[PDB]
Symmetry: D3
Subunit: 78 residues, 6 copies
């Protein structure tokens, strides 16, 4: 689950950033749903859920984890 997700970060994670309770993941064009699917399937305790657009994913942090901490988590796994 997490392993499959971490593999995909390599190719699919262009950058991370955050604001408040949100991690904002940028992907290549069109890749948001594919990387978001892998994140959802990993069912991280830190993650309430995700919404994918086209090249951006909003990852909603489960309190008290912050978006900045989630962003650092994804960066470390890349």
């Amino acid at each position: 689950g997490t392993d499959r997700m971490a593999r995909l970060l390599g190719e699919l994670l262009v950058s991370t950033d955050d604001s408040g309770n949100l991690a904002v993941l940028r992907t290549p064009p069109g890749a948001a749903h594919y990387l978001a699917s892998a994140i959802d399937r990993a069912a991280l305790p830190q993650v309430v859920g995700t919404i994918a657009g086209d090249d951006t994913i909003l990852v909603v942090a489960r309190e008290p984890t912050t978006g900045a901490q989630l962003a650092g988590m994804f960066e470390n796994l890349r």
Copy 2:
């Protein structure tokens, strides 16, 4: 649109959760847009807006209502 929304929450709402000012609603795969449409049309006074992904809807709470209080309202129709 409140009654139609309630019917659709009954049919399509798999789970609710929250973080900060956000209620996170899960649906079966592909049903997020149809349910989010029903929510938008209800024009709830404590809802700023919604975005639907594929199986997840972010519903933005209007202060002073929190994501948790919003999710609780939805959950009570699930």
Copy 3:
């Protein structure tokens, strides 16, 4: 960017906000097109956008608020 400004005039139905989020409404189907221009404008106080069908969430960079982003969009339009 004024590609963004042109599309705000064309597509921005209304603005609203909550916490660190500006909520932009567009005609049905037009959210991705507006959001693209916003992304391309690369505003310092915008962390990113997610477009649905008729709604865009614009994530404000701390300590900018969603209300402030909303007013900026009204200003550029």
Copy 4:
């Protein structure tokens, strides 16, 4: 499977039409993915695949079945 999809048709199938090897299904706003997921999961031998837009689904007929025949089949299930 087909049962499940068939019970959606009263609510989700606004109209059917065809051209060549294609059936064009119209749905309410946002329901295209919701109905198309159900069609995909029915795994009909006369359907090669589907693409959902927002209020339209393109259902691709498996030869020798024509779009018009597929359209009739959905109408007959409704």
Copy 5:
């Protein structure tokens, strides 16, 4: 906003194959243009499906995709 104004603003290219007109738009515009086409209620259009930058417009028999594509092209 009307198809007849948006075709010029939103079309990158028109092309065709068989019963399909294939329209390309800038990134993210497919649904916005396709909405306009849907609302134009053209007798020779069975329906549209939009992805992100591409729309398939289904020609009503016996109209061909080339005939539809020509119409979209000429109104740009």
Copy 6:
């Protein structure tokens, strides 16, 4: 590097290929359709008129006289 990136992603993302008439129908894992279709689009194959992606399906529209079956066989064999 357009065609090579496409060839890589076909192997990684194709679940199955099929066809009907002037269409190749490509199936991907859930959510991967746009990312695969992007690569196809960027490869700009002279026999592909365009593509449309849903969530887990892609239609690739063949340029006449190339058929859906010919494109599908080309895609299948790049896996």
